[PDB]
Symmetry: D3
Subunit: 237 residues, 6 copies
Amino acid sequence: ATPHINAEMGDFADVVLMPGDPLRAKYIAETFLEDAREVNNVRGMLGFTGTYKGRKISVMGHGMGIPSCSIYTKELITDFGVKKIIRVGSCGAVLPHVKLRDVVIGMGACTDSKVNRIRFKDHDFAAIADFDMVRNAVDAAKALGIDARVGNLFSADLFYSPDGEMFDVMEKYGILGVEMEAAGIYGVAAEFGAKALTICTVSDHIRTHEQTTAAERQTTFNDMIKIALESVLLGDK
Amino acid sequence: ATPHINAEMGDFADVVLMPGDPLRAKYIAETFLEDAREVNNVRGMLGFTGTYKGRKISVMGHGMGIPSCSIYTKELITDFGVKKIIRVGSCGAVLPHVKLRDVVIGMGACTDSKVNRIRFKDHDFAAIADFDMVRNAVDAAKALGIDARVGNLFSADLFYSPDGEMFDVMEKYGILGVEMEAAGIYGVAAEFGAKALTICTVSDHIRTHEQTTAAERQTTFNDMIKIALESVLLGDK
Amino acid sequence: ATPHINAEMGDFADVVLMPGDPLRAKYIAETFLEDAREVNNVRGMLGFTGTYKGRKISVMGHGMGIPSCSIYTKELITDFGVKKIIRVGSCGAVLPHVKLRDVVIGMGACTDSKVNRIRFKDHDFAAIADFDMVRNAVDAAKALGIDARVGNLFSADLFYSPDGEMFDVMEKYGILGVEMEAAGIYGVAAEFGAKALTICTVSDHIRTHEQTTAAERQTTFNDMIKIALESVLLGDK
Amino acid sequence: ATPHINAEMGDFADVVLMPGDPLRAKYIAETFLEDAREVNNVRGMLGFTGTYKGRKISVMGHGMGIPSCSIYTKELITDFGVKKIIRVGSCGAVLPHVKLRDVVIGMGACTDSKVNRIRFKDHDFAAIADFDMVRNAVDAAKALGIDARVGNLFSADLFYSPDGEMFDVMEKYGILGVEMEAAGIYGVAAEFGAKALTICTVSDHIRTHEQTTAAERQTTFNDMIKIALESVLLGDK
Amino acid sequence: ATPHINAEMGDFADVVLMPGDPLRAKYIAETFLEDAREVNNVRGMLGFTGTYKGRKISVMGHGMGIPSCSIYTKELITDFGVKKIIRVGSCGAVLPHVKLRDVVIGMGACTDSKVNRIRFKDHDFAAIADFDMVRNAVDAAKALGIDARVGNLFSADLFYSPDGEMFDVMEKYGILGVEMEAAGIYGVAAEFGAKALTICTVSDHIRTHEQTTAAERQTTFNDMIKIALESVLLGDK
Amino acid sequence: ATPHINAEMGDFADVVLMPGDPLRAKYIAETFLEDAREVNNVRGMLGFTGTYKGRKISVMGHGMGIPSCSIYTKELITDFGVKKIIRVGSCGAVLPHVKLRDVVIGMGACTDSKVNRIRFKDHDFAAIADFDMVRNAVDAAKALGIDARVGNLFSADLFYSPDGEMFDVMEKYGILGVEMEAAGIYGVAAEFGAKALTICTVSDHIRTHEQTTAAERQTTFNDMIKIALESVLLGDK
Ligand SMILES: O=c1[nH]cnc2c1ncn2[C@@H]1O[C@H](CO)[C@@H](O)[C@H]1O
Ligand SMILES: O=c1[nH]cnc2c1ncn2[C@@H]1O[C@H](CO)[C@@H](O)[C@H]1O
Ligand SMILES: O=c1[nH]cnc2c1ncn2[C@@H]1O[C@H](CO)[C@@H](O)[C@H]1O
Ligand SMILES: O=c1[nH]cnc2c1ncn2[C@@H]1O[C@H](CO)[C@@H](O)[C@H]1O
Ligand SMILES: O=c1[nH]cnc2c1ncn2[C@@H]1O[C@H](CO)[C@@H](O)[C@H]1O
Ligand SMILES: O=c1[nH]cnc2c1ncn2[C@@H]1O[C@H](CO)[C@@H](O)[C@H]1O
C-alpha cells in the first residue's frame, strides 16, 4: 500500500484509465468493464479492475491539477507495475475550428507549471505522449467512425488565470485544448519510464461558447472511453 | 451554481473550513456541527453548512494541490460571499524539534509553484495568512491547552520531488511543515480580497520518522478542528 | 569589530531598532534613550546604546536598500549577539484606504530583489516577521490608542522604477506600503536564526503625490518609535 | 527573393528536406533527385529542386543551430509557399539502449534555448512535429525493413556544453538524441502555420566517444533520406 | 583536425577575422591577403591563411547565430592556437542617428540568448570585448579617417522576432546594432581564454527598412576590413 | 532640492566622483579640492564642490548597494545637470594574480541583481562604462606611472553570499573585482542618459582573507583619486 493507494502489487492492471472526476471511475467499471472489483477507496478516490474483451483494465480518478495526478500516476507506476496511463477527460477550446464535443488527442502538452523545469534543470522539456499510444487512439477512433484531432494541449495550473491574453497566444500556436493534467502525467511517465496518453473531449469554448444536452454529453463521453479501451487492444497487437 | 459547486448564494456560511481529504468533510459536520445540511456534491466534493455554538459554519474539501484548492477557494469567495477560509490539514516536518502530532500555524507559505509569480509579474509575493486569524488560532489553542507553533510552511507542487536537497534548504530556513495548498490559498485570498489561514498537524517526519496510533490521529485531528472553530468565535469578538 | 562596525561584543543590546537614516538613529537615541553612548561610526552609520525604562536598548541606521541593511543586520546577529531587530522607517502607500500618518506593521514583505531566490534555490521564500514581535507591536499600539495595520509590505530595489505597472499590481494584491529593505532583513533573520520586524509610517501616497513634514507627522513618527520600544518591553515579560 | 534566399516563388517545392551541411544537400539532390537544379546559393547555403518518382521535391541546407535554421525555414514558409519541412540530420546518443546507425524520429524536441519561451510568454511550449508526418515516416521506414525510434530529441545551443550534468538528466528522461535545431524548427512551424519533422541517424554516442564514417554509416544515412522521401509520397496519397 | 575543421595546428594564424558569410571570407582572402591558401571547407565553411603587410592572417566564416560561431571559435582557440578573433559582420540599426554603412565597435554585447546564463549560474555576465583590441580598432579607424561608434551590440537568437516592442527597449538603452553572434563569441573567448572584438557595418535599419545595395556595400565593407587588419598590426606593435 | 539631496541646480559640477563611504568623500574634498564647500548632508550623505587645477569638481558618497547608489546617481543626473559620474571604490579580488591595493577599471560589470533584467525585458543587458572615460582613466594612470587592469567587475547584492561556489565561476570568467554598485550605476547612466566609469582599489581578497590596513590604504586610495581627477582633465581636452 502507498500513502494514497491502499492496495498491493497485482491489484491494478498494467494499463490504467484515469478520469478527473472520481465519480466517473465506477461509471466506467459498471458500463464498460466485466467482473469489476474495487481496489482502492483512500480519500474517496475509487479504483477498479476488470476486463474488456478479455483484457485486464483498471480505472481510477486522479483529481484536478498536476500535483494531484502526479501523486497517483507516480505511485501506480513505481508500486503497482503500471505501464500505460490513459487520461480521459475534458477541455476548453481556443480554436474556432475546434467544436464542442470534438475528440482531441494530446501528442504534446504545453504548460505554465514549474514541475518539468524543476525536473529538467530549468530548461524546456517537451512533455509528450507515447507515439504508439497516440496512433492506437487515432486508429481506434477511425474504426468507430470518429475523427480525432491530434496536437498540442495546454495544462494550466490556474483554471481562473489572472491574464486572459495567454489564450490568444495559445490560439496563435495551435493549442487544441486547455486542461490541467497532461503535462504533469507526461513528466511523470518520462521520469519513471512508463507510457502515457491524454484524450479529451471539448466541453466548452473559452470565448464564444454554446450549449450541449446531458444526453449529448454522455454519448460523447462513452465515445471517448470506447476509443481509449479499443486503443489498448490495438496496442496489444 | 459554479462549474465545481452546484449551489446558490447563501448556501455557504461566510466562513469555510476545508480539509484536503473529501471524506473528512462529513465527519466534521457530524462530529462538530449542529443542524448540518448538504450544499454540494459535484465531483464528490461534499459540502456542508451548520452551526457551532450558534455560529454559521461550512465545511468542504479542496482536493490535493494548489490548482485544485485554487478553484474552490476562488469560487467560494467570488460567488458565495465567503470571507474567511481555514484550511485544516496535515504536513511533514523537516525540523528535529518539530514532533509528530504538533499543531502548526502557517503565518506564511513558501512554494515551488509558479502561480504567484504569474500573478506578481514574476516577482516575489509573500503569501501570508490574515494576522487576526493567526492570533485567533493561537489564542484558541492556548485555551484548549495546546501550544501551536507559528511560522512558515512550504507548499510543494511535487509530493515526490526529484531533488531531496531542497529539504535541507527548508530546514535551514526554519520551515515548520511541508504541505501542498497554503501558498495557493493565500494567493487566491489576496487576489480576491478575502482572508485565509492554514492549520496543520505533523503527520510525518520527512527523514527520521516514527509511528502513531489511529486513536492518536483522531484525537489530534479533533484538536485541530476544535482550535479552528474556536478561533472563528474569537475572531467574531 | 567587523568590517562595517567598529565595536565589541557587549556594545550593543540584544535588541536593535533600525531607521534607514543615520541621523534618525541619533535623533532616536537623543529623544527616547537614557544614558546613551555612540558605539559605532564607520562610514557614518551611527549606532547608539542606552536604556528605555531601565531596559538596555540599541538603535543604529542601516542605509537604504536590501544590500545595505543585510550587511548590518547580518553582522549584528552573528558578531554582536543581537537577537531582535526592529526596522522603523517610512513607506509609500498604494492602497487608497490607507492615508498618511498611518502605522503599518509588516507581517510579510514582497520583493523584486533576487536575494531570497538565491537563498531558496530559485523558489518562492515567504519573507515573514517573527509572529511574537508582530503581536507585541500590535498590543503596544493598542495600549497607546493606535490602530496599526498588519499586512504585506513591498521591498523594491529601485526607488525610481522604470515601469509604473507594478503599483497597480501591488494595490490589487493588498500591499500596504512600499519600502526598500524589509524583505532583505527577514531573509537574513531566517538565514542566521534571529528575529525581526518592520514597522512603518506612511510617508507619501502614490494615490496623489503628497508628503509634507509637520508637527503631526513628527508626532506619528514618535508614536511608531514608542510602539517599537514598548513592544520589546512586552516581549521581555 | 528574401534577404537569405535569392530565388522566386515557384523555385522550391511545397516540401523541403533540410540537412545542416550545405554540401549534404548537393549530395542528396545528386543522389536521389532527377532533373535537379540549384535554386539558391546565398552565403553558400545550396538549395536544389528536382523530382523523386515524379514528385517535385526540394532540398536545402540550414546551417547549424536554431538561430540559423529558424531564419531559413521561416523564409521558406512565408515567402516560398513551403508547406512541409523535414530536417534530416545526425544526433548524439545518450541512452545506452541506442546505438549508431539508428534512425530516430523526433516527435518532440526539448531545448535549452530561450526562443520558444520568448514566443510563449515565458511558459513551457511543447515543441512537437506534425503527427501525420511522423506516422508517414514510421510507415515508410517499416516498408524499408527499418525499425525507427520515435521519441524526444534535445536541441542544444552549445555543441560544447560548459556542464556535462545535463546528459545524465537527458538520459534519465528518455531523450533519444542530441542535435541543434529541431526545437527551433518546430517553433517556427507553429508560429507560421506549417508542418515539420526531424529525422536523425545516431552519429556518435556520449556513452563512449565513438563515431567513424564507413560504408554502413553511409548506407544508414541514405536509408534516412529514403524514409524522408518515401514518407512525403505516403502523405501525398 | 577538429569535428568541424579539417586542418592541423599551424594552418591558421594566431589571429583570425570572421564574417558570418563564407563567401565573404573568400572575398577577403582574395582582396586583402597575399599568398592566400585554403585551409578548410568542411560544411562549406571556407577558411583561408595568407599575409597582410607581411603579417600572417587567417579569415574564415562562422555562419549565422551564436550556436554556429560558438563551435568554430571554440575549435580554433583550443586546437589551432588562435589567440585573437575579430568578427567582421553586418547589423541592423535601431537608433535614428545611426546611418546605413556606418561602422560600429562592440565594446559590449547584450543578448536574449541563454548561453551566458548557462555559463554564469543564471546571473548577469557582461559580455565584453578585449579593451586593447577595442582601442586598436578605434585608432586604426582614425588613422584611416573612417568614423566608428563604440558601444553595445545586441545579439538576437531570432532574426525574425515575434516581439517588436523589444526594439524600443534596445533604442532606449543606446544599442548601436542588432546582430547575432557577438555575445556568444565574447562568452567563448572568456570561457576558453582568448581575446575577441566584433566590428559591424550597419547593413540595414530595423525601422526604415533599407537593404544594402549599390557600391555602398563594397567600400563600406572594405573599410570594416581595413580597420580590422590594421588594428591587428597596431596590436603587434 | 530632490528627495535625497538638499541642493539646487548649480551646486554640483557637471562631473562627480563617488565613493560609497561619505567620510571618504569628505576626505577627498579636504585633500584634493580647493575652496571646497558642503552642498548636502541629508541622511548624512555628504556632498562637496570645489576645484582641481582650476576645474570645478564635486564629490559625494552614494552608500552601499545598487539600490542606494541608483537613487543618488539618478537625482544628480536629472535634477543637477551632472553629465559624468566616476565611482571610486574598493573591491575584493577573486583571481590569484590580483594583489591587494591594485587598481581596476570596470569596462563592464556582471551582477546577480535583477535591476537590469527589469529594465531590459528580462534579457541580458551588458552593463558597460563609457569608452572615452575608460580610455581617459588608462592614459591618466600611465601618466602617473600607476598600474591598472581593465575588465569586468561583479556587482553583488549580498556582501555575505550564501553561495561561495559562485566565486569559482567569477574567477573562471576573469572577474577582476567584487563590489556592489557598478552594474547599477551603469544601468542608471544608460536609463537616464549620462556617462559613468567605476575605478576600484582591491581592498581585500575573497580567498586569502586580507583586510586593508597600514599606510597602504592612503597612498593606494590617493592613487585611485589621482587617476579619476586627472582622467577628467584629459576628458575636457
Ligand atoms: O476550460 C477548461 N479549462 C481548464 N481545464 C478544463 C477545462 N475544461 C475541462 N477541464 C478539465 O476539467 C477539470 C477542471 O474543471 C480539470 O481536471 C481539467 O483537466
Ligand atoms: O509529507 C508531506 N508532504 C507534502 N504534503 C503533505 C505531507 N503530509 C501531508 N501533506 C498534505 O497531505 C496531502 C498529500 O498527501 C496534501 O493535501 C498536503 O497538503
Ligand atoms: O514611496 C516610497 N518608495 C520606496 N521606498 C520608500 C518610499 N517612501 C519611503 N521609502 C523608504 O524610504 C527610503 C527611500 O527614501 C527607503 O529606505 C525606503 O524604505
Ligand atoms: O553529439 C552531438 N551534439 C550536438 N549536436 C550534434 C551531435 N551530433 C550531431 N549533431 C548535429 O550535428 C551538428 C553539429 O555537428 C548540429 O547541426 C547538430 O544537429
Ligand atoms: O537586422 C538584423 N538583425 C539581426 N541580425 C542581423 C541584422 N542585419 C545583419 N545581421 C547579421 O547578419 C546575419 C543575418 O542575416 C547574422 O549573422 C547577423 O549577425
Ligand atoms: O569583498 C567585497 N565584496 C563585496 N563588496 C565589496 C568587497 N570589498 C569592498 N566592497 C565594496 O565595499 C562596500 C562593502 O563593504 C560596497 O560598497 C562594495 O562596493
